[PDB]
Design a protein around this ligand. Structure first.
Ligand code: HC4
Length: 125
């Protein structure tokens, strides 16, 4: 396992340019999105939480295709505001309920260091 805690202040530096295999070593779910919400990376811990197959969701749009329950002001709205402003950093609880048992999580969205890239971190609550 990689020694990184959910919510750590410099998480974007520690994860920066992490390849797919190392991302799978994290204790929490990690997704990397472009500014439109297309999925660039999606780790094993996230797949274990959500049921999605990490290899198949790459390239899909998170808000339009994979996760319509997040297409709302409280999730997508916050994401796109942070993309538009270039500085996103927000943490909030949410319930995932699309075609799977409703599952409450804590979500941390934070702008990455790499261009046109934005992290969505997830753990169970
Ligand atoms: C609601 O539709 C949420 C769906 C979802 C959340 C997070 C994921 O990694 C995959 C699907």
């Amino acid at each position: 396992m990689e020694h990184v805690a959910f919510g750590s202040e410099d998480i974007e530096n520690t994860l920066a340019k992490m390849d797919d295999g190392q991302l799978d070593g994290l204790a929490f779910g990690a997704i990397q999105l472009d500014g439109d919400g297309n999925i660039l990376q999606y780790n094993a811990a996230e797949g274990d939480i959500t049921g999605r197959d990490p290899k198949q969701v790459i390239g899909k749009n998170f808000f339009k295709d994979v996760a319509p329950c997040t297409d709302s002001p409280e999730f997508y709205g916050k994401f796109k505001e942070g993309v538009a402003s270039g500085n996103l950093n927000t943490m909030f609880e949410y319930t995932f309920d699309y075609q799977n048992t409703p599952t409450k999580v804590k979500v941390h969205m934070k702008k990455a260091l790499s261009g046109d890239s934005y992290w969505v971190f997830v753990k169970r609550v």
